[model samples]
Target: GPDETLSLLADPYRFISRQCQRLGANAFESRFLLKKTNCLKGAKAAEIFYDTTRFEREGAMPVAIQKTLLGQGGVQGLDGETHRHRKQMFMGLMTPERVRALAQLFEAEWRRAVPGWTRKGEIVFYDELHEPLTRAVCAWAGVPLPDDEAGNRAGELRALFDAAGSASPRHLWSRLARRRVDAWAKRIIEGIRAGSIGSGSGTAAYAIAWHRDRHDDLLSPHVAAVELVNVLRPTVEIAVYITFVAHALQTCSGIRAALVQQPDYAELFVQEVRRFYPFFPAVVARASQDFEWEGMAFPEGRQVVLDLYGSNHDAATWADPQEFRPERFRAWDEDSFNFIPQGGGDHYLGHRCPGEWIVLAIMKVAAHLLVNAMRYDVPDQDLSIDFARLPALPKSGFVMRNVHIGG
Candidate 1:
């Protein structure tokens, strides 16, 4: 088969699912980047993709992603016991109490920013969210971020995820941002080791600076820095999800009213947004050894790409997956593999994202605030999503104006 890297890059979110539908199969073998690869989707594929014995993370990610979205020597690429230990370090920060604290910090930041938004003629809501989220996450993680430097730091963090999948020169920006952030994090880690920087025991900064590897030795400063940025980067990227929450409130009929009338409905609303919107298009892994599943052979060391967006929209799993309906969650059976906006599987034992609870907590806060705490007019702007972009966003970044402080 011919290389399909260009086709996949052109429409990453839909590429695998479209091919599956066209071929009348759930899985297929093809070439990407001139290497033979297997693409799979839906609940069954996710189950197999996440099985640690069948698939491995090491050497699975491409160098482009390692340089930008996921830094080298981080937990994302670890395997087996080493990966579980590293993942446990991250899951430690996601305690229910800590998760609630981060959410409250974000809500406080929102309240503090609303006065400034009301005074402006209009604001790009997506852009405005970056700084507050940066401030909140930094504070919660025990990272020192000066008030004056919040905007600049936030942009650097934002670029790490935002430009990672770009083909334009902006991809260069993502690489540069990665270097800058890694160096900054290294200094913090070194400072903590030198007893110059004090971080609370529970903070992510403190934990990463001192986390030990499977060998029971402290992680190298460079690797520690990468791990720390892994935390800061994704939390800031939640701005994209927050924007989608706002988009849903505006575009999905009667959703805003349901949120206001029923406060608990915010959870279902955010979950629906995560399911419907594009975040991670796919996750990559390697066949641990030769094996067959669903009548497809996965040879050892072969690359496998799992379709996350497609799995979330799989008709077999969700009734009318295309429709934006929050109530679907009310009757939803909690199946980790089926609705994976983030990766699936056990959080501490698999490659699934540990900050998922943080994502949900902050998104619910944003949804509640958007509907009940503030009233804003959606200015005429191009709100259509650009699926061509990785972690897609609306064309105008969801502009809002005529802000009222309280609803």
Candidate 2:
């Protein structure tokens, strides 16, 4: 009952938003970020609210004075130097260029996952596809992904995220998932330290090396490593991504047919999906200090929520927020905060996960493979997304059947 109250109690991010759709829902910011501006235009973090340009985001969470028996408490626990290190060092592993280099690795892994499709005759995308995606990511990151290791690691990664909390019994796994995240990070950091692994084809070895090489920056290599590890953990969007992409294929004939003809649509397509899909409806930032806006005082330590999903679907910005149009994001500027799947902001050196590139690369390649190489019927994502529950697919893990073209 106490944890329930702690879980539900919100300064604003979780309570106000879900109660009123305009505020939106995001797990990371819900628990971590505090709001300062009264106009609801910006979020705060233990001080003043940074402009969208300076802040980075991915997705969202909560807990209490009584304290969470578990959890990094999402990303809320790290602040000041710790948070900064997370940005500099952790981000080292997730650079856009590095992620790009790792793309084919994901493609190959997805092809390997084809066996599950053959055996089940209709493999569950979440389990079958995601496992390989994780392995591919690990391989690219120079993290070994042996069959047993991947299986065990998947379980751990899932547990780390589940430790972040789900609304039901499924959420029980969050603790387990988090521990795995810790272990994996340590393992990778060790590999990087030993010089056994290169920095993702051409990038730095780890965030530490990146920081050292780029700016002669100083940060505890281990902290950065752990934060980087936290990053690789399959997050809220991964579930939404895998399932949402499937949902789009299942329901929309126009989008599906387009993918059939032009699979290069992969990049724009996933960006649009990142934008179009209601994965991160909001982000939470903590008020670092007292600030007033629009005659409202967002005092120090208060949590402010940003409508991430609402921003994407805001009719004021998007011509058709509700529509599934991947083409719209073609030549889309990263400057416009209008489209954000993993929260609106920079990926690193900001509050957001720097590793989004890694996740995106994997998903985009998978979407490409699924659409162009293997095909499956889509599921009905028409169901209203209930953030209270773990953001989920169409009740069947966004399951599909009748496989054919569009792998």
Candidate 3:
């Protein structure tokens, strides 16, 4: 798989294929696997197959991540009808109408805060905007912040993901950093349990209410609270790239002007951003029913790593796969299979980010600000590029000074 292939590539050496994105073509690999079946006999074919049956047996200790995130005996950790039942509970809480309705809060916050940038010329996007935006979400979650604590939490996440944040070998410190996040999660859970803040209709509170209902097998208030924090917190990490889209526009100058003239291209622009920058590069899955692909047979219980970055750049399907051209989606000729920077498969069928729309709104608002209110530069701008993790971002970080407009 691409995961193993990436593991083989050394730092700095990882960029050897640079501009072309040739070696790890997502569609090509999947297609090749499909067509190259001649060599894959029964057992061998089973080795590379994407089986869902033997997930627990084949997957390694760290393999069941979704289950862990979902909580004790959660659907992600279970199988068959058991998984479906728990997933149903989750689905009810993450409806399209609910997500859209919740977005008003995001807009309210954006309107309230964007004017602050009018006075400042340039902005360190992560520090100034994303942090505050997340604090709003966190406050709604349970953690009341007076700015500094919010800033601290935001910075900790950047450090946790950034390779430069840790000097020891390859991200060995992420574990320690995660423990800190775990501790924070515990605090939020306690707050919810103690009734200090975070439920009823606020996003976190609303979600908690669903799980703590009169009849629900999954998620006690304690577990529900932690899951909510974990999902909501780092989920804000995507704002980093939304910040980048603004950087791309402010730096490029003409892109924003172009977008305005073509007002109907909102979906395309967002799709292109998702394609170009991977919010989360890797989505791990384990085989439940052993199957073979590309002549490599994965055992029933082994891990199947999906490289979202590589998938988005599939050379066979996407023309000029590496470029960030939102117009492709605008062109109306864009294929869904080719632009999956996030994981593929029917979003409802399997592991999907239910909060997708919520995150999308945040990006759209940030992008709107870039195109209308602000401008800046990203020249040679790997803008905080972190080389170690290919799919994520630059650990150096992105800072854009806002040339503000309306209040």
Candidate 4:
């Protein structure tokens, strides 16, 4: 088959699922970046894709992604026992209490910024969210972020994921940000180790700095930095989902009313936004050994791309999947493989995002605030999402004006 790199890049969110539809199969053979690859969707396909015995993360992510979205030596690139050991480092920080703490910090930071929003004539909600999220995550992670430098650091962290999937000059900017952030993170790690920085024992910075590998050895400063940035970057990236949450509130008036009438509806609304919107389009892995599934051969080292968006919207699993209905979640079966806006499988055992709890916690807070704590007008602007873009958002970044503090 001809390489579909350009085609996939042209429509990343739908490329794999569209091919499956055209071919009338849950899985298809193709090539990307001139390399033979397999694309799979549906719950069954995700079940197989996440089977660590048959698939692995090592060498699965592309070089461009490594230099930008995922830094070198992070858990996302590990496998086998090492992967589990490293993954535990992340799982330890996700206790319900810790998750609540982060959410509280985000809400406080957000409230602190709301008065400023009201003073301005108009605000781009998407662009404005990064600073508060950065402040919240930094404080929660025990990373020092000066108020004056919050916006700059937030932009640096945002750039890492913002340009991760792009082939344009913005990718270069992402690389530069990676270098700067990694270096900054390395210093934090070093300071933590040297006792100059005092990260609470429960904080992510302290956890990563002192975390011993399977061999019971502390990670190298660089690797520790990468792992710390891993925690920091993704938390900031939740702004993308938050933006979609605001978009949903604006366009789905019925759901918005439900949220106002029933505060618990925020949880359902956030889940639907995650499943219905495009954040991470796909997750990549490589075959660890030759395997056959559904009568198709997967040679060792073959690349496999799992369709996250498609799986969440799979018709077999979701009735009326195209409709923006939060009510569907009322009976959601909680199948890990089907509704993976992040990756799928057991959070502690597989490649699923460890920060999933953090994402949910902060998003619910954002939803609550948007619905109950404030009032604003959605200004006339282009709210259409460009599906071609990775981490898609409204074209106008969801403009809002006439902001008021009271709901």
What is the number of backbone collisions in each predicted candidate, taken in the order shown? 0, 41, 35, 0
Once superposed on the true structure, which residue ranges of model 4 sit more than 4 Å away at CA? Answer: none
The CA lDDT of each predicted structure is 0.91, 0.53, 0.50, 0.91
Candidate 1 on 1-407: residue-level lDDT in tens? Answer: 89999999899999999999899888999999989999999999999999998999898889998899888999999999999999999999999999999999999888888888888979999989988999999999989988888889999999998888888899999999999999998998999899998889999999999998878899999999999999999998999999999898878799988998996788888888999999889999999998999789998999999999999999899969999999999988898899899999899889899988999999998988887778888877899998898878998899998877763
Residue 193 lDDT in model 2? 69
In candidate 1, stretches whose alpha carbon ends up further than 4 angstroms from where it belongs are none
* Residue pairs whose backbone atoms clash in candidate 1: none
User: Tens-digit lDDT track for model 4 on 118-227?
Assistant: 89969999888988999999999999988899989999999998877886899999999999999999999999999999999999999999999988899999999999
Q: How high is each candidate's TM-score?
A: 0.98, 0.74, 0.73, 0.98
Q: Which lDDT tens digits does candidate 3 get at residues 77-142?
A: 444454455445556655566656445555566566556755666555655555655665665554
Better of 2 and 4 by TM-score: 4
How well does candidate 1 score on lDDT at residue 358?
A: 97
The residue-level lDDT of candidate 4 at 399 comes to: 91
- Give model 3's TM-score versus the native structure: 0.73
lDDT of 1: 0.91
